[PDB]
Amino acid sequence: SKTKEGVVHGVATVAEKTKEQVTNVGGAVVTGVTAVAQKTVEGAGSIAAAT
Amino acid sequence: SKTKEGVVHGVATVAEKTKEQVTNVGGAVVTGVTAVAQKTVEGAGSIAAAT
Amino acid sequence: SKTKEGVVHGVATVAEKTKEQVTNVGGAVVTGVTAVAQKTVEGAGSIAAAT
Amino acid sequence: SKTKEGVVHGVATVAEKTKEQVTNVGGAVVTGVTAVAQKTVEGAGSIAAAT
Amino acid sequence: SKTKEGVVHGVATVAEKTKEQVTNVGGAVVTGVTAVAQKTVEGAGSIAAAT
Amino acid sequence: SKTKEGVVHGVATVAEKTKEQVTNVGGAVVTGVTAVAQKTVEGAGSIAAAT
Amino acid sequence: SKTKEGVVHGVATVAEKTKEQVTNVGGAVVTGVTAVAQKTVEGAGSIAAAT
Amino acid sequence: SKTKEGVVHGVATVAEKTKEQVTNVGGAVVTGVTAVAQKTVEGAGSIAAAT
Amino acid sequence: SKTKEGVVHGVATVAEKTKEQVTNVGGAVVTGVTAVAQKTVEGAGSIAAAT
Amino acid sequence: SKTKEGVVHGVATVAEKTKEQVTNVGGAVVTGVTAVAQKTVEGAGSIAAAT
Amino acid sequence: SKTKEGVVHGVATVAEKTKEQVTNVGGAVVTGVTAVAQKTVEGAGSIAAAT
Amino acid sequence: SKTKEGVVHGVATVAEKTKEQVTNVGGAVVTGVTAVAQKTVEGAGSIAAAT
């Protein structure tokens, strides 16, 4: 029995001349998440979560 | 028995001359999530969730 | 039994002439997460989470 | 039984002429996380988390 | 039984003419984490976490 | 039984003409962590954590 | 005056589980040409030409 | 005056589990050309040409 | 005046579990050319050419 | 005046578990050319050419 | 006037568990050429050429 | 006037568990050429050439 969970593979990306500006005064800001994998057996699991 | 859960593969992207601007004064802002996979056995699981 | 959890592989990326600016006055800012894998047996697990 | 958890492999990246500027006055800022793997048997586990 | 946890391998990176500037007045700033692996049997485990 | 935990291997990097500037007035700044592995049986374990 | 001739850029490709078989007994066979650029000021110029 | 001729840049490719078989008894076989650039001021110029 | 000819840069590739078999009895076989640049002022210039 | 000819730079490659077999009985076989640059002022110039 | 010809730089490669077998009975076999640069003012110049 | 010809620099390579076997009965076999630079003012110049 082969089981795969939270697997990311074979990703090819090319970014050229990309400009990003973030200004924060309060609270939380989350950005630019790429090729992220996570497995949580128990408990709350969050990815790129801003509260 | 082969089981796949929360699997992302074979993604090819090309971004050229893309401009992004974020201004935050309060609260939460979430942006730019790509190729993200997550498995949660128990508990609340959220992806790119802003509260 | 072969089990894979939270696995990232075969990622090729090319970034050319990318400009990023972050200004923070309060709170929390999270950015630029790439090829991150995590497994948590118990307890809350978060990736790129800003509170 | 072969078990893989929180494994990252086969990552090739090329960054040319990339400029990053971070200005912090309060709070916490997290950025530029690449090829990071972590396994936590018990307790809260967080990656690139800014509070 | 072969078990792998928190393993990073086969990473090739090339950085040419990259400029980074960080200005800190308070709080905590974390940046530039690459090819980091950690296993924690018990207790909270965090990677590149700024509080 | 062969068990690997917190293992990093086969990393080849080339940095040419990279400029980094850090100015700190308070708090803590952490940067430039590469090829770091740690195993903690008990107690909190943190890598590149700025408080 | 900015002049570009025979320029290829921003190509991202992902090939997974592709099988190719070529059997040749005479003549010429040409295949699998990708991201090829050529400029010839004088004389015959051919790309992936089988005679 | 900035002139570019026969220039290839920003190519990201990922090949996984690709099988190629070539059997030759006579003549010429050419295959698998990637990211090739050539400039010929005078004379015949050919790329991946089988005669 | 900045002139670029036959220039290849910013190439990131990842090959995993690729199998290649070549059997030759006569003639010429050419394969697996990557990131090759050539400039010829005079005379015939050929890349990966099998006669 | 800055002139670049036959220049290759910023190449990052990762090959894992790749198998290659070549059997030759006559003629010529050429394979596995990577990151090769050549400039010929006069005379025929060939790269990975099998006759 | 800064002139660059046949220059290769910033190459990072990682090869793990790669197997190569070559059997030759006649003729010529050329393989495994990496990071090779050559400049010929006059006369024929060839790289990885099998006749 | 700064002139660079046939220059190779900034090469980092890691080879782990690589197996190579060559069997020769006649002719010539050339393999495993790395970080080789040559300049020939006059006369034929060849690198890794098998006749």
Author numbering:
A (entry chain J), B (entry chain L), C (entry chain H), D (entry chain F), E (entry chain D), F (entry chain B), ...: 42 to 92
Q: Could you pull the original sentences from the published paper?
A:
pmcα-synuclein (αSyn) is an intrinsically disordered protein that aggregates and forms amyloid in Parkinson’s disease, multiple system atrophy, and dementia with Lewy bodies. The amino acid sequence of αSyn can be divided into the N-terminal positively charged region (residues 1 to 60), the highly amyloidogenic non-amyloid-β component (NAC) (residues 61 to 95), and the C-terminal highly acidic region (residues 96 to 140). Here, six residues at the N terminus of αSyn are identified as regulators of amyloid formation.
Accordingly, a deletion variant lacking residues 2 to 7 was generated, named here αSynΔN7 (note that Met1 is the initiating residue and hence was maintained in the construct). The results showed that under the conditions used, αSynΔN7 forms amyloid-like fibrils with similar yield (85 ± 4% and 87 ± 5% for αSynΔN7 and αSynWT, respectively), but at a slower rate than αSynWT, with T50 values (time to reach 50% of the maximum ThT signal) of 23.0 ± 2.5 h and 7.2 ± 0.3 h, and lag times (Tlag) of 18.6 ± 2.4 h and 5.8 ± 0.3 h, for αSynΔN7 and αSynWT, respectively. A structure could be determined from these twisted segments to a resolution of 2.5 Å. The αSynΔN7 fibril core was modeled from residues 42 to 92 arranged in two identical protofilaments with an extensive, buried interprotofilament interface involving residues 50 to 58. This arrangement is consistent with those obtained previously with αSynWT and C-terminal truncations of recombinant αSyn. By contrast with these longer deletions, the structure determined here for αSynΔN7 suggests that while deletion of residues 2 to 7 slows assembly, the fibrils that result adopt an αSynWT-like fold. Hence, despite differing only by the presence of residues 2 to 7, αSynWT and αSynΔN7 are unable to coassemble into amyloid. Surprisingly, and in marked contrast to the behavior of αSynWT, αSynΔN7 does not form ThT-positive amyloid fibrils at any of the lipid concentrations studied, despite binding to DMPS liposomes with similar affinity to αSynWT and forming similar helical structure in the bound state.
